[PDB]
Amino acid sequence: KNSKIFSPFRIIGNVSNGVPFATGTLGSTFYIVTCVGKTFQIYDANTLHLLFVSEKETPSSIVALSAHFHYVYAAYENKVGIYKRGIEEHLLELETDANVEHLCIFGDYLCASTDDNSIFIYKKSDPQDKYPSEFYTKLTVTEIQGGEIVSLQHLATYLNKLTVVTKSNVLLFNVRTGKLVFTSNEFPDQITTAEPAPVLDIIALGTVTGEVIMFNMRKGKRIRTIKIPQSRISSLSFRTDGSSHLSVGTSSGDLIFYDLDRRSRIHVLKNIHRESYGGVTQATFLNGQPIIVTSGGDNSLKEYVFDPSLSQGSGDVVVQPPRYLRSRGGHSQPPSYIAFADSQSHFMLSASKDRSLWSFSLRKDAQSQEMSQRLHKKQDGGRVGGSTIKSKFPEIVALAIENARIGEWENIITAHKDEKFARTWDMRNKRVGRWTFDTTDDGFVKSVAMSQCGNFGFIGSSNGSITIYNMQSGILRKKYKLHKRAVTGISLDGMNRKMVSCGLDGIVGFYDFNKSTLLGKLKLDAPITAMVYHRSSDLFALALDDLSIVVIDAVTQRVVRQLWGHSNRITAFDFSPEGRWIVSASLDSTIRTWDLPTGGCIDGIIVDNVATNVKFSPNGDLLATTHVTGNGICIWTNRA
Amino acid sequence: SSLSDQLAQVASNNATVALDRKRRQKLHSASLIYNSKTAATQDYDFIFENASKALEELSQIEPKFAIFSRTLFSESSISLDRNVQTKEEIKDLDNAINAYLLLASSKWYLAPTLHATEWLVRRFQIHVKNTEMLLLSTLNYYQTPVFKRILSIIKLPPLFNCLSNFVRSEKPPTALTMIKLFNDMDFLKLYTSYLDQCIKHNATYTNQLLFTTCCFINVVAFNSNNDEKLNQLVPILLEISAKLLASKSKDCQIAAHTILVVFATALPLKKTIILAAMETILSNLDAKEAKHSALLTICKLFQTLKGQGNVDQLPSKIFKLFDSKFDTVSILTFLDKEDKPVCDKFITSYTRSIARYDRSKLNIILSLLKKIRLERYEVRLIITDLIYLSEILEDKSQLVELFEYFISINEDLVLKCLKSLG
Amino acid sequence: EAAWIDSDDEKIKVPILVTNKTKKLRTSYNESKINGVHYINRLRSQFEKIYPRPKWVDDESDSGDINALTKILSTTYNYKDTLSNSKLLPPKKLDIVRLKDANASHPSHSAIQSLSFHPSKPLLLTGGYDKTLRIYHIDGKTNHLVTSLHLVGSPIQT
């Protein structure tokens, strides 16, 4: 499973996996710790710039995250790790196979709750020690005492008491003596969230049937009850800017605000996060400011701000609605296609099954941007035909990009699922272009290609026709008709002279683009699934249906190499920039490197998730691959 | 931000400091009774003398004004400067001023209020500091000359931006622009808070309710096309109606009736909201004029209901309340008058309510059905219930008579209900 | 009145001066150690200084009534009756969605002079001066052509 040429680098395009993020304050500034699968990222609350990432990938997925000043505690399986600046400093290993669920740190005590309703307490070896390491004691809540633990919390001004919140009721545990100080009355509804209020002795509890309870621990009595019918609470948080506001997040993807003083609703933010991915998994008011940070399972993190009231007097009643401030995001579902935008490791295009196309920056996450889909007005002046309700374009099946003419006109072509035309995009403006290319044979688009000069675009139809357009004006120039089955690949050499095509019928046609003549035709035994053309060496490889990669020299029109060994279909493959290697992935969950001079496999990997795409950087320093699972992109460094 | 923008903010904060003679000329020249040239020549003692006399006349009209002779119109108030006061003291000062603007809201037609208010304009500079309260209290006098004088000497807040053009303009602000100012949602929250204070203080008067109702009614009219914006108005203006119904003053209650009706016809609402709406209407219904208007509102609200349960019976608690505030004889008079509005859906729900909860009024049902013609489905529902009554309730001379009434009118439909039920 | 009492607090004795933050708790300079009950009470007072006590916690508690209308507004967020149950369509807003063309499967060569839906079956009939009777199976997604009938020299006016 360990490559001798490649090694993991990091994952691009993930901001949050849905686990509740943790907010930490250093001095005046704040930072947000978000979980990404087996590692966490730390963003600056001011600019949402990445600062640190976990040095090593955790063996198992992270379940809980808590941050106190420099130190960050990350829980996975039965181990709680302590991290500083993204480097592990110490590992806490619990003595029970039960997996940790929740994590609370107050004072010198670290409290870990396992799924078996057992709470483990650690203590600092020295009062001045930075983090707890020593094992103090174990507290277990039995079914008679209460139900499953919902979350651990510690209210302010409580000496060595831990407020254990269970589904049935709330409990108060004195960690120092390990004795149950107080037991709450049983509640009718199942509790799902707990948030300490800025007031004393009051903890906000959220039920599964839209009830928010301002339970008073000192009195052991209810103080208030907000009602949210037909909703499920997922997060609670209080505004500490001197205004008594409460933000109640819900699994449906809504965020409601209540003004406790006036017993009124300020506003509701609808569909900030997708309901399919858990809605508002976490929403936290920044301590003492009107900014609220919200997250969800849709791979996005947002910030909203309350502007000052617009009335000089009675600023309390006239509350401005929350305003979008900033955010970072990625794909909600795994990317379908990828490509390297520029010669350097500069930018990377990604299109996913969520119908969104993104331009990702390898060198700074802040630079990553979504390519907008707002259309140009037609040159003719006729009205554009489209549904009034705005919907994203279908999934991108194929993509081709060139940079010979970036900034002068369109330079990207994309093919869509079950769509009879290919759309154009402009990388410089980062928006859809103004040209649409039709196959003109009632056939779906199966292949797209661009000439190196950036003047022509080739569209391969499912009915066997190749249409050639001009990118500058989007006017059709030539149409080639040789294949009777779907064309699965098109390429043109650097000199814009010889053109090569491949189709499911198994024939590879060789064309002279200047003279528009058929130089020759080659029949292979099996249907051809994909094509990669190497312009520097004039060699192109074809992924045949019989689980082979056939390399052909366009100059002489003969098979030069044939590669065998894959046990299933070849999802994708690419040439190395120097033209010496081919890296291919297949459904059998492996990536193989093929040395073309010798025509043999020199390296092999076993990936847990099938590699749907593989792409070398033009430099050759980085290899990027995408998998059937995971919203991000896996980046590999080339040890060669 | 540029240096100029920050200085502009600094300039606004020190608007009333009177740093130099030129600044004093602008601040002291502002007046409601005197032109600029004569105003500058005047002294604080002269202005206070007229105001002290003016407040006395107001006190004769209404004793409550006499209290301010102790606080705002005292001889010691002459030496009181707002700038040198601390934050706590200013808030205390603003509460007194805000209270006065409420009393003066209804007496602006009297000349003494113009002389009583001049002291606050010159001494405490309310036209610069408490500009929002001053405009709101005088909002309904927009066609009067006094409002024109206020607009001239006043700097408009961001929310009152629509009135900017009518500053120092010969024409008074038009009724149409007044609708535009109310159209803004932030203004409605601002006005609602002000109107809430009036309800708390029993400071309301007829002219305020009339003007407040019209703008509220007109706003719904302007947003009738936009259903989404109507949805945003429901939390605010209905919440106002709840407050208005709480006022013991009958005039406030009638305004709530006027406001509530327009929403129901403008926007269909859940039967839960309509049912709750009645309970507030009937909870504090004491004045006869309110009782007349309320009953008109009750029937209109049901007429808007257009969903399953459109004519289902009233809940038990609601029915008892309605009967107490409206005896059967009263409604028989209501159905008697020829100009009665369409109320059949309510009468159907009321009619089915009688059968479920009262057995003594069954004779009243017969009288009601004759007075008002019910629509085909409503008649069918009533027959369906009375069939159930016969099987459960003992057969009575009145009960069979109600059937006999249906035998006379549309005998075939009576069989259809019987066929479906038994 | 406290529902619970913790005896550990009365016994424990903490030093204040060890850390910078706690030093502000001292009432006098001489003291250096205070028992737990006083230590908590000092923390509570200091906590209020960081977060002032708002009005809602103390003065207000929940623990025909006129305020029914106000209560129902709080619980309900969508104030419009669901039009699904109502059998009577809204006056001014029409909920209309377009589907695929009926003629897309097999186009007509003249104006559609008349249309007719079959009383029960899902068929649509089109006729025109093209002199043809084209019947379509209106399914809303495909609309294929069931049959056709050309009537020579018989313009279809209806």
């Binding site: 304050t25 001095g27 005046s28 500034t29 609350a45 001011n46 107050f106 004072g107 010198d108 005590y109 009062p127 510690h154 302010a156 001004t157 409580y158 000496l159 060595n160 120092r176 500490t240 800017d241 301590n287 003492g288 400011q289 009107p290 900014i291 701000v305 502007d307 000052p308 617009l310 305003r323 401030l325 | 931000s1 961001p158 929310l159 931006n161 629509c162 900017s164 535009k180 803004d184 932030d186 203004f187 | 550990d8 016994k11 424990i12 004795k13 903490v14 850390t19 933050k21 706690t22 737990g36 230590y39 923390l43 906590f47 960081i50 977060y51």
Partner: peptide, 27 residues
């Protein structure tokens, strides 16, 4: 003119927060 709705720049302000470290004590 209708009400001007400008989005003013919002910059962070230092805010004091309670430290839970004082909560723990040892006998």
């Amino acid at each position: 003119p209708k009400v001007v709705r400008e989005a003013k720049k919002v910059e962070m302000t230092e805010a004091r927060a309670y430290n839970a470290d004082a909560d723990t004590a040892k006998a």
